Structure formats: C-alpha cells, structure tokens
Design a protein around this motif. Structure first.
Motif, short mmCIF file in Angstrom:
data_model
loop_
_atom_site.label_atom_id
_atom_site.label_comp_id
_atom_site.label_asym_id
_atom_site.label_seq_id
_atom_site.Cartn_x
_atom_site.Cartn_y
_atom_site.Cartn_z
N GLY A 190 100.89 -38.17 -75.78
CA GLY A 190 101.25 -38.66 -74.46
C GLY A 190 100.24 -39.62 -73.84
O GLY A 190 100.26 -39.89 -72.62
N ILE A 191 99.29 -40.05 -74.66
CA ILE A 191 98.23 -40.95 -74.25
C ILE A 191 98.80 -42.35 -74.18
O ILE A 191 99.59 -42.75 -75.03
CB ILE A 191 97.01 -40.85 -75.17
N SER A 192 98.43 -43.08 -73.14
CA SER A 192 98.88 -44.45 -72.95
C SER A 192 97.93 -45.48 -73.55
O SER A 192 96.72 -45.30 -73.73
CB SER A 192 99.06 -44.76 -71.47
N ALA A 193 98.49 -46.68 -73.73
CA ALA A 193 97.65 -47.80 -74.15
C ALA A 193 96.54 -48.08 -73.12
O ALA A 193 95.40 -48.41 -73.42
CB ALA A 193 98.55 -49.00 -74.40
N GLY A 194 96.86 -47.88 -71.84
CA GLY A 194 95.86 -48.13 -70.80
C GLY A 194 94.74 -47.13 -70.84
O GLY A 194 93.61 -47.53 -70.60
N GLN A 195 94.97 -45.88 -71.23
CA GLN A 195 93.87 -44.92 -71.40
C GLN A 195 92.97 -45.29 -72.57
O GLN A 195 91.76 -45.15 -72.51
CB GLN A 195 94.41 -43.50 -71.55
N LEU A 196 93.55 -45.81 -73.65
CA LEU A 196 92.75 -46.25 -74.79
C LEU A 196 91.91 -47.44 -74.33
O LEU A 196 90.75 -47.54 -74.66
CB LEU A 196 93.65 -46.62 -75.93
N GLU A 197 92.52 -48.36 -73.58
CA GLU A 197 91.80 -49.50 -73.06
C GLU A 197 90.65 -49.04 -72.18
O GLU A 197 89.55 -49.65 -72.19
CB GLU A 197 92.81 -50.42 -72.33
N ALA A 198 90.81 -47.99 -71.38
CA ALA A 198 89.75 -47.51 -70.51
C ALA A 198 88.56 -47.03 -71.34
O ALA A 198 87.40 -47.20 -70.98
CB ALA A 198 90.26 -46.40 -69.62
N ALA A 199 88.90 -46.31 -72.42
CA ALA A 199 87.84 -45.85 -73.31
C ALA A 199 87.05 -47.01 -73.89
O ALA A 199 85.82 -46.95 -73.92
CB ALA A 199 88.31 -44.52 -74.45
N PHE A 200 87.73 -48.06 -74.35
CA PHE A 200 87.04 -49.25 -74.86
C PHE A 200 86.17 -49.92 -73.78
O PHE A 200 85.11 -50.42 -74.03
CB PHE A 200 88.03 -50.28 -75.40
N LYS A 201 86.62 -49.90 -72.52
CA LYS A 201 85.86 -50.54 -71.46
C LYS A 201 84.60 -49.74 -71.15
O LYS A 201 83.51 -50.30 -70.99
CB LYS A 201 86.67 -50.70 -70.17
N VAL A 202 84.73 -48.42 -71.13
CA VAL A 202 83.57 -47.57 -70.93
C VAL A 202 82.60 -47.75 -72.10
O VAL A 202 81.40 -47.91 -71.89
CB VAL A 202 83.95 -46.09 -70.76
N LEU A 203 83.11 -47.81 -73.33
CA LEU A 203 82.24 -48.01 -74.49
C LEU A 203 81.50 -49.33 -74.42
O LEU A 203 80.31 -49.38 -74.75
CB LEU A 203 83.10 -47.93 -75.76
N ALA A 204 82.21 -50.41 -74.05
CA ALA A 204 81.58 -51.73 -74.02
C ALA A 204 80.38 -51.72 -73.08
O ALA A 204 79.33 -52.25 -73.42
CB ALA A 204 82.56 -52.80 -73.62
N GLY A 205 80.50 -51.08 -71.93
CA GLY A 205 79.34 -51.01 -71.07
C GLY A 205 78.27 -50.05 -71.55
O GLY A 205 77.08 -50.34 -71.42
N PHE A 206 78.67 -48.93 -72.15
CA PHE A 206 77.73 -47.95 -72.67
C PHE A 206 76.86 -48.56 -73.74
O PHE A 206 75.69 -48.24 -73.81
CB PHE A 206 78.54 -46.77 -73.20
N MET A 207 77.45 -49.46 -74.52
CA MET A 207 76.77 -50.06 -75.66
C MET A 207 75.67 -51.03 -75.26
O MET A 207 74.85 -51.39 -76.12
CB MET A 207 77.78 -50.73 -76.59
N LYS A 208 75.60 -51.40 -73.98
CA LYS A 208 74.51 -52.26 -73.49
C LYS A 208 73.18 -51.58 -73.74
O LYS A 208 72.21 -52.29 -73.98
CB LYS A 208 74.66 -52.62 -72.01
N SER A 209 73.10 -50.25 -73.82
CA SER A 209 71.84 -49.55 -73.99
C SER A 209 71.36 -49.62 -75.44
O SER A 209 70.19 -49.26 -75.67
CB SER A 209 71.97 -48.11 -73.51
#
Ligand code: HEM
Ligand SMILES: [C-]#N
Length: 142
Positions: free
Chosen positions: A100-119
């Motif tokens: 029941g997971i949406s494409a937008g929830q997967l996109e949110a995870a990628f957005k959080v990862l992209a910023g997390f990866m700055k470290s």
C-alpha cells in the motif's frame, strides 16, 4: 540528466555511508521517520506496534538498515545499466506497492537519503539525479 560525475559521486559517497551503515543506517531511518510519520506507519508490523522513539536500537531496525543498503548498493553499482536498474526497480516496486506504499513515499525516502548523504561527501544534486532516474523506472509500476 545523470552525468558521469554525478554517478561517480553517488558511488563513492555510497561507499562511505555503506562502511558506516551499522550506525548510520539506523540514523537515516530515524530521520526518515521524523520527517514522514506515514512512512513510519508502514513499519508498524515490523516494529510490533512500538512508538517511533523506541525503535532505533532494535534488532528489527538493524535488519531493516541491512535490507535497505543491499538494494541501494545494487543500484549504485549499475548506474550505466538501465536494464539492470529497471529489473531491480520492478521487483522493488511490486513489493512496496503490495504494502500500500505510494510512489510519493518512495520519493520521500530518496529525498531524505539525498540530504543524509551530504555527511558522506555526497552531492545532494547527484543523489537527486540518481533518484529521479530510478523514480522514472519505479513510478509506472506503482
Ligand atoms: C527508497 C527506498 C527504499 C529502499 C531502497 C527500500 C528497500 C527495501 C528492501 C530491499 C526491502 C526487503 C525486500 C522486501 O520485502 O521488499 C524492503 C522491505 C520493506 N520496506 Fe522498503 N525500501 C525503500 C523504501 C520504503 C518506504 C518509503 C517504505 C514505507 C513507506 C518501506 C517499507 C518497507 C517495509 C514495510 C518492508 C518490509 C519490512 C518487513 O520485513 O516487515 N520501504 N525495502
Ligand atoms: C525499506 N526499508
């Protein structure tokens, strides 16, 4: 839309995060859960109902961090191979759609990862480009 340099940065910074993922992965999930409570909700079976503020140091979280990493490593090792990437995305999409997971929830995870990866030396723009490529494969299947 996805340069050689962006790919190289994503691979190299992923190597750094991967080396630290026994501690960093739980932190990434907590950042994800804190930004998107609805993402945390889909893990309420895994975490057997527990409140968000208790899950970081659970065995389930250590397993989940390993699961997430294994697929990101496969993607990042194949960034010149659309067919390989598509094949991994198709499986991933089907599993997460069935929850029941949406494409937008997967996109949110990628957005959080992209910023997390700055470290880890990540260029947030490079992680954004890779995520955009993967979401273009994923979305049709969600
Ligand atoms: C972009 C990133 C993501 C990656 C790389 C990722 C990767 C994975 C992989 C490899 C698995 C194990 C195979 C399977 O059962 O599908 C998994 C399981 C799962 N994922 Fe994800 N996932 C992503 C995003 C999400 C999001 C956004 C949610 C929730 C809204 C989520 C919820 C789940 C759940 C609930 C499990 C099963 C946990 C369980 O064992 O009980 N995933 N994911
Ligand atoms: C999925 N983690």
């Amino acid at each position: 839309s996805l340069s050689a340099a962006q790919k190289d940065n994503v691979k190299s910074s992923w190597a750094k995060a991967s080396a630290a993922w026994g501690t960093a992965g739980p932190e990434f999930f907590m950042a994800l859960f804190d930004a998107h409570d609805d993402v945390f909700a889909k893990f309420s079976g895994l975490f057997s109902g527990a409140a968000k503020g208790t899950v970081k140091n659970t065995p389930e979280m250590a397993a989940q961090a390993q699961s997430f990493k294994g697929l990101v490593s496969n993607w990042v090792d194949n960034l010149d191979n659309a067919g390989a990437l598509e094949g991994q995305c198709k499986t991933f999409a089907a599993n997460h759609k069935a929850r029941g997971i949406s494409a937008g929830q997967l996109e949110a995870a990628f957005k959080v990862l992209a910023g997390f990866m700055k470290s880890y030396g990540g260029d947030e723009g490079a992680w954004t480009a890779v995520a955009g490529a993967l979401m273009g494969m994923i979305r049709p299947d969600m």
